[PDB]
Nucleic acid binder design. Structure first.
Length: 434
RNA sequence: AGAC
């Protein structure tokens, strides 16, 4: 019933064939019933996996993650969640899709949350149908979904720093382990400890994934030590997961600044994705998930919820209507719809700051709502002293567009612009006008 | 930390 103007949530457990089996079945039916359809992948890596499953079916890939020959007659488009939301913020022709399919519809990136709000609103207006696919539908707080094989779940004291004794079960194990850590720095410490104990370790994060993930498929390894990059798009031939049950997330303090808070407890959805790396083979019983604490009861602290509202308040629907967040996650923010709707010129600035500046949503919003123009970078240098950005333990400096060397000290502090080397490099280029 |  794809023509029915309703939202279907497909709760598809890890390993149940969401991409390899269910998605092609949906897409074939959409094509046969001549429905203009958009497929929303959470990441480039997942978009490339979808192309393998959809090979032969006529799909227009709107991502450079895939390069196949298009016929020009395709009625099914595929793009990443954030591409979709970005396109909604531009004064562009928003195509009139009859059917929206979102894979990994638990994803709490602010563009993903915004996309679900836009899509569910369109469905509630009678304008479209949608399908949301995930192991953990928004609203559901279960960390232990079904699996292809039974998983032994055991809560234990999980080491979170290098250890010299007291965790023998970690290194006495004869199988292969995927270990989820909150940060790159924390994983480097655990990995070094394991390597000293004689184990073969591969480390995964956003920065290293392209090169290192392939090694997990082609080299022998004992441990994969990974951030939450491996919650989506990543599968392993493993027998055990060790889970800190911790992550780092951006949090807005006092409405005034953003910190990268934590390590803090992961959500149920993320814990389910982490556990879901094992128990995948019905012919390989006995896989184990060893976890270190509870999941987050509260989630409303994360900045992504307010950021999603900032995006949605600035996406034009016909006649200036504003979309709501998807209902099961609408209570995660306490703001009235339209609070963050910017007037025309400031809205253009906000959009440009995000798309060309690569600024976080919250930061882009502060600058745009201040009346600052996109190209005026004075604000990067005129904050209070406690906003001075440090690099190698001394104040970071930039050569500006005006040929002066100035200390980086932004008027609004968002820790995401300087929390790793790539982010700081980008923000320095921004501050320089380059 | 993740993301286009």
């Amino acid at each position: 019933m794809l023509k029915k103007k309703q939202l279907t949530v497909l709760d598809l457990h890890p390993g149940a064939g969401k991409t390899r089996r269910v998605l092609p079945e949906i897409v074939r039916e959409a094509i046969k019933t001549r429905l203009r359809t958009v497929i929303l992948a959470p990441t480039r890596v997942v978009a490339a996996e979808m192309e393998e499953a959809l090979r032969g079916l006529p799909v227009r890939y709107m991502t450079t993650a895939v390069n196949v020959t298009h016929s020009g007659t395709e009625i099914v488009d595929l793009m990443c969640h954030a591409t979709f939301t970005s396109r909604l913020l531009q004064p562009i022709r928003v195509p009139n899709y009859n059917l929206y399919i979102m894979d990994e519809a638990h994803f709490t990136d602010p563009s993903s949350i915004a996309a679900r709000g836009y899509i569910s609103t369109r469905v509630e207006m009678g304008e479209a149908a949608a399908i949301f696919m995930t192991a953990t539908p928004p609203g559901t707080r279960d960390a232990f979904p079904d699996s292809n094989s039974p998983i032994m779940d055991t809560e234990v004291e999980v080491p979170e720093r290098a250890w010299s004794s007291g965790f023998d079960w970690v290194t006495d194990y004869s199988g292969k382990t995927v270990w989820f850590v909150p940060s790159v720095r924390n994983g480097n410490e655990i990995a070094a400890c394991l390597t000293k104990a004689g184990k073969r370790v591969i480390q995964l994060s956003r920065k290293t994934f392209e090169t290192e993930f392939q090694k997990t498929k082609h080299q022998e390894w004992d441990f994969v030590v990974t951030t939450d990059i491996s919650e989506m798009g990543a599968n392993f031939k493993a027998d055990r997961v060790i889970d800190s049950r911790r992550c780092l997330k951006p949090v807005i303090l006092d409405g005034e600044r953003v910190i990268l808070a934590g390590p803090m407890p992961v959500t149920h959805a993320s814990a389910a994705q982490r556990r879901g790396r094992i128990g995948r083979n019905p012919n390989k019983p006995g896989d184990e998930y060893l976890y270190g604490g509870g999941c987050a009861e509260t989630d409303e602290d994360h900045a992504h919820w307010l950021e999603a509202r900032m995006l949605l308040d600035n996406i034009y629907l016909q006649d200036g209507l504003i979309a709501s967040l998807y209902r099961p996650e609408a209570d995660k923010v306490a703001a009235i719809e339209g609070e963050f709707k910017l007037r025309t010129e400031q809205r253009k600035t906000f959009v440009e700051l995000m798309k060309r500046g690569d600024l976080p949503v919250w930061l882009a919003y502060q600058v745009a709502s201040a009346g600052i123009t996109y190209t005026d970078r004075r604000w990067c240098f005129d904050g209070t002293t406690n906003n001075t950005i440090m690099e190698d333990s001394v104040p970071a400096e930039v050569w500006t567009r005006h040929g002066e060397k100035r200390v980086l000290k932004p008027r609004w502090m968002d820790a995401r612009v300087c929390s790793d080397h790539a982010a700081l490099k980008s923000f320095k280029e921004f501050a320089a006008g380059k």
